[model samples]
Target: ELRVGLEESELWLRFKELTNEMIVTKNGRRMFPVLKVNVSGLDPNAMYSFLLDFVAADNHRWKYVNGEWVPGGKPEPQAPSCVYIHPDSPNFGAHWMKAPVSFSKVKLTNKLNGGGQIMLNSLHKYEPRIHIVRVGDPQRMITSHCFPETQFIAVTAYQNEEITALKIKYN
Candidate 1:
């Protein structure tokens, strides 16, 4: 079974307000939006794997031209595919999600860190998905469950103004 809970009950509403404030100039802005989830009802003695992956909306990638959405002349090469492992992995399942069960805060970035950054085409739509896997044994490891958990789509800066506002309002 899976259960979802907000890190901050009011954060979503608050984020909505900030999204309406103004455009996040080229300088870029840090999103106040954050996801905090708790894990429970799991086999505490097992090991779990967490991953983050992004997918493009369509094969025809996009590029920003004159501040407008325009198709690039040619299909751009596929964006980089990377997964972020939850930093606090490798703990006993029970101890990991024992009492104050929670996962580390995940972050989204546009700048290519050149290392593990998941690359994205500018102005192209993409979605971020979170997965959690359950490993029953370490010496004889086997995946028990693979959960394709959360989804977050990339969009033009402030394109989803309502979402931002909703976040602000909730926050």
Candidate 2:
């Protein structure tokens, strides 16, 4: 239930800058941005769900401009909708945090030929969400409890301008 800040982290600042740039083709881009969270106040034996979801900035298609990506002229009547789930789920929070956790390791890909990458639009802005779920025993499985959701600040890409700053402060 703690709010981790990345005000002075250099790594976070760098990531944010990368996100604003156009992703190049023929190269696998790595997410400079990552979420490092330290969580406590949870039962060691309880199960938790770690989910990441993305939402579009608006119902419009964006186009890559001279050197940046920006919203196109007209809004699309409808846009494709899809949700990205963290490859890892239903894990024990205590166990996951036993060692350093890296959310930056997550990948996003437009090339359908590869695996383990979340699909996303090239020029669109997306938001990321993380949810923690606590599962009860089998007898009470139907009555599991859910924790408040955690959301990343609105970002255009997996990386953000605050990456460098974030790393400087936390790492």
Candidate 3:
């Protein structure tokens, strides 16, 4: 059920250090530079679905005061929990068990009417979770994984000035 982490890991890390920030608005937030991963070891005939669950990585709310991070308070009720299902769900494992798993469809939001997009909160730490669900098989419990290095702080706006500068330079 493993083949090491993704080749795309390095790029994510470089940007993650600047504190990857995803904006939340009344409408929704779409963070495009999500994860594209590599995975293997599954029954080729069995059906599988891929999706993302953005979970609070810590129990703290964050504040950026004077360009530094501080714990604001306990996290809000986790912003309504959810999982963003792969659009092409229930595909045969052969499709997903491919060498490089694609996170092409992953997105997040903060919408009350958000049609099941992964819901998260502003100024909170989160870990993007990848889950593999086997179709029609209640016996098939969800399998998931997360990277500590990939943790992020969500915000309605960019918080760190240095990161803001880097984001400006990169974009």
Candidate 2 lDDT over residue span 1-171, tens digit each: 523233224544444444433231223344434544445655667776555445555666566456455666554333243333444556776775565434565555544434444555555555554545566555533221221122122224423334334544454
Task: Please provide, for model 3 over 1-171, each residue's C-alpha lDDT reduced to its tens digit, 9 standing for 90 to 100.
Answer: 544265567766776877777676666666635567766776789888887777787878988877678898888886876877777788987787665666665556666766666667878988877888888886877788886656788787887776667666655
Give stretches of model 3 more than 4 Å off.
Answer: 168-171
Q: Which number leads on TM-score?
A: 3
Candidate 2, superposed: residue stretches over 4 Å from native:
1-10, 14-29, 63-70, 75-88, 111-114, 136-171
Q: How close to the true structure is residue 72 of candidate 2, measured as C-alpha lDDT?
A: 69
Q: Which ranking of candidates, highest TM-score first?
A: 3, 2, 1
How much lDDT does each candidate structure score? Answer: 0.49, 0.46, 0.73
Give model 1's TM-score versus the native structure.
0.54
Q: In model 1, which range of ten residues has the least summed lDDT?
A: 17-26
Question: Which candidate, 2 or 3, has the higher lDDT?
Answer: 3
> Candidate 3's error at 145, in angstroms?
1.0
- Kindly list the per-residue Cα lDDT of model 1 for residues 1-171, writing each as its tens digit: 554344453553454333222222233333344445556666766677755556665566454455444565554666667676666665666764654433344444555554434555554545444566666554654322222222233444554546655646655
Lowest lDDT 10-residue stretch of candidate 3 = 1-10
How close to the true structure is residue 17 of candidate 2, measured as C-alpha lDDT?
47
- Rank all candidate structures by their lDDT, best first, as comma-separated numbers: 3, 1, 2
Model 3 residue pairs with clashes: 123-154
